[PDB]
Symmetry: C3
Subunit: 32 residues, 3 copies
Protein backbone atom coordinates (compact mmCIF):
# COMPACT_ATOMS: atom_id res chain seq x y z
CA UNK A 1 0.00 0.00 0.00
CA UNK A 2 0.91 3.66 0.38
CA UNK A 3 3.93 4.77 2.34
CA UNK A 4 1.49 7.47 3.49
CA UNK A 5 -0.85 4.76 4.81
CA UNK A 6 2.02 3.15 6.72
CA UNK A 7 3.06 6.58 8.03
CA UNK A 8 -0.47 7.20 9.32
CA UNK A 9 -0.43 3.81 11.03
CA UNK A 10 2.80 4.81 12.79
CA UNK A 11 1.19 8.01 14.07
CA UNK A 12 -1.91 6.10 15.19
CA UNK A 13 0.11 3.53 17.16
CA UNK A 14 2.01 6.35 18.86
CA UNK A 15 -1.25 8.12 19.74
CA UNK A 16 -2.69 4.90 21.17
CA UNK A 17 0.33 4.17 23.37
CA UNK A 18 0.23 7.76 24.64
CA UNK A 19 -3.47 7.33 25.44
CA UNK A 20 -2.83 4.04 27.26
CA UNK A 21 -0.21 5.82 29.38
CA UNK A 22 -2.74 8.55 30.22
CA UNK A 23 -5.35 5.95 31.19
CA UNK A 24 -2.79 4.20 33.41
CA UNK A 25 -2.09 7.48 35.21
CA UNK A 26 -5.82 8.09 35.71
CA UNK A 27 -6.49 4.59 37.07
CA UNK A 28 -3.52 4.97 39.43
CA UNK A 29 -4.90 8.23 40.86
CA UNK A 30 -8.53 7.12 41.31
CA UNK A 31 -7.81 3.45 42.09
CA UNK A 32 -9.38 1.91 38.98
Amino acid sequence: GMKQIEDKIEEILSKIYHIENEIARIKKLIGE
Copy 2:
Protein backbone atom coordinates in the same frame (compact mmCIF):
# COMPACT_ATOMS: atom_id res chain seq x y z
CA GLY B 1 -3.83 0.89 -1.13
CA MET B 2 -7.54 0.31 -0.65
CA LYS B 3 -10.00 3.16 -0.44
CA GLN B 4 -11.48 0.94 2.29
CA ILE B 5 -8.15 1.04 4.15
CA GLU B 6 -8.08 4.84 3.91
CA ASP B 7 -11.72 4.97 5.05
CA LYS B 8 -10.88 2.86 8.11
CA ILE B 9 -7.98 5.19 8.90
CA GLU B 10 -10.41 8.13 8.81
CA GLU B 11 -12.71 6.38 11.30
CA ILE B 12 -9.75 5.51 13.54
CA LEU B 13 -8.47 9.10 13.63
CA SER B 14 -11.96 10.31 14.53
CA LYS B 15 -12.23 7.71 17.31
CA ILE B 16 -8.83 8.74 18.68
CA TYR B 17 -9.65 12.46 18.76
CA HIS B 18 -12.95 11.66 20.51
CA ILE B 19 -11.03 9.58 23.07
CA GLU B 20 -8.50 12.36 23.64
CA ASN B 21 -11.40 14.75 24.32
CA GLU B 22 -12.84 12.28 26.84
CA ILE B 23 -9.46 11.95 28.58
CA ALA B 24 -9.17 15.74 28.74
CA ARG B 25 -12.57 15.94 30.44
CA ILE B 26 -11.55 13.26 32.95
CA LYS B 27 -8.24 14.93 33.81
CA LYS B 28 -10.05 18.25 34.24
CA LEU B 29 -12.50 16.74 36.75
CA ILE B 30 -9.99 14.79 38.86
CA GLY B 31 -7.05 17.20 38.46
CA GLU B 32 -4.74 14.95 36.45
Copy 3:
Protein backbone atom coordinates in the same frame (compact mmCIF):
# COMPACT_ATOMS: atom_id res chain seq x y z
CA GLY C 1 -2.90 -2.89 0.13
CA MET C 2 -0.82 -5.09 2.40
CA LYS C 3 -2.35 -7.91 4.39
CA GLN C 4 0.05 -6.58 7.04
CA ILE C 5 -1.62 -3.16 6.83
CA GLU C 6 -5.04 -4.76 7.27
CA ASP C 7 -3.69 -6.84 10.17
CA LYS C 8 -2.41 -3.68 11.88
CA ILE C 9 -5.81 -2.05 11.41
CA GLU C 10 -7.41 -5.05 13.15
CA GLU C 11 -5.05 -4.65 16.12
CA ILE C 12 -5.72 -0.90 16.24
CA LEU C 13 -9.51 -1.34 16.27
CA SER C 14 -9.17 -3.87 19.10
CA LYS C 15 -6.95 -1.49 21.08
CA ILE C 16 -9.45 1.35 20.58
CA TYR C 17 -12.44 -0.69 21.75
CA HIS C 18 -10.46 -1.81 24.81
CA ILE C 19 -9.62 1.84 25.53
CA GLU C 20 -13.26 2.90 25.15
CA ASN C 21 -14.22 0.21 27.68
CA GLU C 22 -11.59 1.55 30.10
CA ILE C 23 -12.88 5.10 29.68
CA ALA C 24 -16.43 3.90 30.33
CA ARG C 25 -15.30 2.28 33.59
CA ILE C 26 -13.53 5.49 34.65
CA LYS C 27 -16.52 7.72 33.88
CA LYS C 28 -18.76 5.31 35.80
CA LEU C 29 -16.56 5.51 38.91
CA ILE C 30 -16.06 9.30 38.97
CA GLY C 31 -19.45 10.26 37.51
CA GLU C 32 -18.25 11.72 34.21
